[PDB]
């Protein structure tokens, strides 16, 4: 379960851009401000190999 990708990004990748950031993102309207839940599904998902 370790190998990882961001399931979302709030801006699409520039050519050869990298992004380490651990932001939860707005998956909806509400500013969740560090909460995970509806409007805020944390993006760094992983494969199940």
């Amino acid at each position: 379960y370790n190998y990882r990708y961001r399931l979302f990004r709030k801006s699409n990748l520039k050519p050869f851009e990298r992004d380490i950031s651990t932001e939860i993102y707005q998956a909806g309207s509400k500013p969740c401000n560090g909460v995970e839940g509806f409007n805020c599904y944390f993006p760094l998902q992983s494969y199940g190999f």
Binding site: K14, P15, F16, E17, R18, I20
Partner: protein, 112 residues
């Protein structure tokens, strides 16, 4: 007195920031998730690092397709008052494969 630059987006350890520290022509460059002080000065995931009025220095910095490009020139001058007229062309120094987003910058000074 002028000895470096900060470049990046949030500039606050939440993401990578290109830091250049210089003493004329020897240089340290890093891109790491730096936590700076609130007033940046030089006292008289760390994925990239590199190491190298009488006077005018000129530079052009541009960030394209995941590479950061620097051009420069040095010359002595006579106009103390302001940016001088006349013609000169900068030449490339370095091209760094750093892969980073940049929307803000700040200059770094050596203080007592």
């Amino acid at each position: 007195i002028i000895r470096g630059w900060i470049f990046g987006t949030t500039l606050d350890s939440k993401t990578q920031s290109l830091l250049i520290v210089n003493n004329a022509t020897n240089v340290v460059i890093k891109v790491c998730e730096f936590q700076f002080c609130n007033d940046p000065f030089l006292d008289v995931n760390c994925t990239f690092e590199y190491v190298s009025f009488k006077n005018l220095r000129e530079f052009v910095f541009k960030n394209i397709d995941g590479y950061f490009k620097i051009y420069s020139k040095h010359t002595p001058i006579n106009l103390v008052r302001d940016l001088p007229q006349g013609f000169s062309a900068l030449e490339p120094l370095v091209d760094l494969p750093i892969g980073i987003n940049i929307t803000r910058f700040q200059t770094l000074l050596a203080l007592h």
